[PDB]
Write a protein that binds this ligand. Structure first.
Ligand SMILES: CCOC(=O)c1[nH]cc2c1N=C1CCCC(O)=C1[C@H]2c1ccc(Sc2nc3ccccc3[nH]2)o1
Length: 249
């Protein structure tokens, strides 16, 4: 067990706001490494608690270069502090907004890193990650980090009130692959009710610039019947992925 204290850190700029408190860039005073210090107000946190609890637990046991690291935690009487990895390149969402859409190389690379992280997650029994672009951070090398962390992306089984399994993550990967290449998720519409229908019927169109290999991959992942979706290893072996990914799996 390691005891941390506020005094061990040099607090820097705020990196953002969570529904429960702020996140700051911070430097640990001895090592000088740089990290994110997330603050959660004990009070409104019971407005629940002991979950997050599950959360620090889960994130603490996950050790992967494509999953945001939790280095430790400490607390006082209105605050709990999470010592988190700092992702210097920001969010993938920011990158998508700036470029409007990603090329095949960038997309296939991100999908490789995500499939690897998801495969590791599943190997540790963790499933159903929210991998929307705003929840994906970028490390120093431009490598993606799943930053889960205590409707467009919901699979049919979910919106149709059935039970779901790890196959929900494959559906997410397909929606993500489409959003990366196109700049918007595939079932986007005006009203939630119209989006629910699109998802339920797997109703979406491809822009002309989406290639043959990309369509094959996306269409397989976005199968209504979860058992018909490819396994993560089949995604990593898909020819469109092995042609375009700038990194091995
Ligand atoms: C790209 C720059 O941002 C970061 O590097 C970074 N590192 C950690 C975070 C973060 N940038 C932001 C933006 C503002 C909202 C928020 O919470 C964070 C924070 C973060 C997002 C997700 C997690 S992991 C985590 N959060 C938890 C909450 C409760 C219990 C366990 C948790 N693990 O930490």
């Amino acid at each position: 067990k390691r005891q941390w204290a506020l005094e061990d850190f040099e607090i820097g700029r705020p990196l953002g706001k969570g529904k429960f408190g702020n996140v700051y860039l911070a430097r640990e005073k001895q090592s000088k490494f740089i990290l994110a210090l997330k603050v959660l107000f004990k009070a409104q946190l019971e407005k629940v608690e002991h979950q997050l609890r599950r959360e620090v637990e889960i994130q603490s046991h996950l050790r992967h270069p494509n999953i945001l690291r939790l280095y430790g935690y400490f607390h006082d009487a209105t605050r709990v502090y999470l010592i988190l990895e700092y992702a210097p390149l920001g969010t993938v969402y920011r990158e998508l907004q700036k470029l409007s859409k990603f090329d095949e190389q960038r997309t296939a690379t991100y999908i490789t890193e995500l499939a690897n992280a998801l495969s590791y997650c599943h190997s540790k029994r963790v499933i159903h990650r929210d991998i929307k672009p705003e929840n994906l951070l970028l490390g120093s090398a431009g490598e993606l980090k799943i930053a889960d962390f205590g409707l467009d992306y919901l699979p049919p089984e979910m919106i149709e009130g059935r039970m779901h399994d790890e196959k929900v993550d494959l559906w997410s990967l397909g929606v993500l692959c489409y959003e990366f290449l196109v700049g918007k998720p595939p079932f986007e519409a005006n009203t939630y009710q119209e989006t629910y229908k699109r998802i339920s019927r797997v109703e979406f169109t491809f822009p002309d610039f989406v290639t043959e290999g990309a369509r094959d991959l996306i269409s397989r992942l976005l199968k209504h019947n979860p058992s018909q979706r490819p396994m993560l290893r089949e995604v990593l072996e898909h020819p469109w992925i092995t042609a375009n990914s700038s990194k091995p799996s």
